Amino acid sequence: GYTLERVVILSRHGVRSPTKQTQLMNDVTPDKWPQWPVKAGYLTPRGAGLVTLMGGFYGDYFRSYGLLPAGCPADESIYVQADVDQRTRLTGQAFLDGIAPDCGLKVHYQADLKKIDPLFHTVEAGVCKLDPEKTHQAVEKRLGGPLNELSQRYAKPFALMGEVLNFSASPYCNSLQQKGKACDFATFAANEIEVNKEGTKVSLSGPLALSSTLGEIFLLQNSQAMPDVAWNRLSGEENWISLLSLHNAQFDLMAKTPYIARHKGTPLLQQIDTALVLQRDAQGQTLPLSPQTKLLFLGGHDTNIANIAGMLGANWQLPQQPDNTPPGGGLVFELWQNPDNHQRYVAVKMFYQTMEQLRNADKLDLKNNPARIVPIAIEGCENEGDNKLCQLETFQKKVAQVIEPSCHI
């Protein structure tokens, strides 16, 4: 039986309200968008509740492998570091409240909340720049051709989005008709990538970008347990998968394309790796970890998970969760050891709540209703057995190959 030595969780924050509403999001449907109980982008109180339920599951799971004891953890054995946003801070705290209730443990974060954290937003912080030509070339290579082919590649999902929106009856469609254009949702505008002149932001505009945002909104509505999701026009598991495939495609192109992913993800990959093996003074280990550290939780974003997955050549689909980087989901790194020969191994898993588990705020447990756990294959690793184990030396080698040296924190 192998020993679980240490764990790093790269978590998305929990259920949040939508990002700020734009005129375009309004104009592509005749219907009114449901209002939310919190400011744009904030974790909702129900979202914090769900994260706490997941924290409880994490606690049950890790305690089953003796990583943490019963009751309050040994001090300094869990470290929780969050990005500066409300949704990430509060997710970190909701996690602790679940995994170690009434233990006085606290989320930690950057001293100045009014500045970007380069660990979570490396390119934004100017650590390293994206070159516009290389970015365009890389996203072509990822996609397998020009952006105009997205309309065919995702024809059925785009048609479904237009249906869900009732796009044909929308102000945007009328503006097309008045110029003598048809109202094909897939081609309402061009898909275009823009790298700013500083090389500190890459943005996508057009139908894929919009559809990625809107599909997430619907998924959030459902996860928040709002009574009317997508105006009652979105039903069925395959429709959910198809609609969210636009969102996942947008994350693949904009966040997993290795040129972009390695620039954005180097600091987090190094922090993960160095925490996992507990090389406390190695380059890229940015946190005041103790020798007794057993578990690091990193409270971040879907983009962070995607960046890491793109660096590591990881790709997945989550049963009963159509967003690959879902609310409250965590990309979990486990260090295992064979006590017989001392060989160590890394395992990578997505831990997540299904749509139904989020909507119904299901209490989670190891036996009857567990969070879902999906083992993740890593490109160039042994991926051996059901747990897809990578030999530690192989994993360390892979990390060293895919980091961008210029993007060290």
Residue numbers in the entry: 6 to 414
The publication says:
The structure of Pi-YkPhy was refined at a resolution of 1.67 Å with two protein monomers in the asymmetric unit, each modelled with residues 6 to 414, and with very similar folds (rmsd = 0.22 Å). The overall fold is essentially identical to that of apo-HaPhy (rmsd = 0.96 Å over 391 residues) and is shown in Fig. S6 in the same orientation as for HaPhy in Fig. 5(a). Each monomer contains two Pi molecules in its active site. The first Pi superposes almost perfectly with the 6-sulphate from the HaPhy-MIHS complex. The second is coordinated by His126 (corresponding to His128 in HaPhy) similar to the 1-sulphate of MIHS, but does not superimpose with any of sulphates of the MIHS ring. The YkPhy structure is very similar to that of HaPhy, with a very close overlap of the active site residues, suggesting that it is also a 6-phytase in accordance with our biochemical data.
Phytases (myo-inositol hexakisphosphate phosphohydrolases) catalyse the hydrolysis of phytate into inorganic phosphate (Pi) and lower phosphorylated myo-inositols. Here we report the identification of two HAPPs from the enterobacteria Hafnia alvei (HaPhy) and Yersinia kristensenii (YkPhy), together with biochemical studies of their pH and temperature optima, as well as their phytate degradation pattern, which show that they are 6-phytases. The enzymes share a common catalytic site architecture located at the interface of the two domains involving the conserved N-terminal active site motif RHGXRXP and the C-terminal HD. The two-step reaction involves a nucleophilic attack on the phosphorous by the histidine from the RHGXRXP motif to form a covalent phosphohistidine intermediate while the aspartic acid of the HD motif serves as a proton donor to the oxygen atom of the scissile phosphomonoester bond.
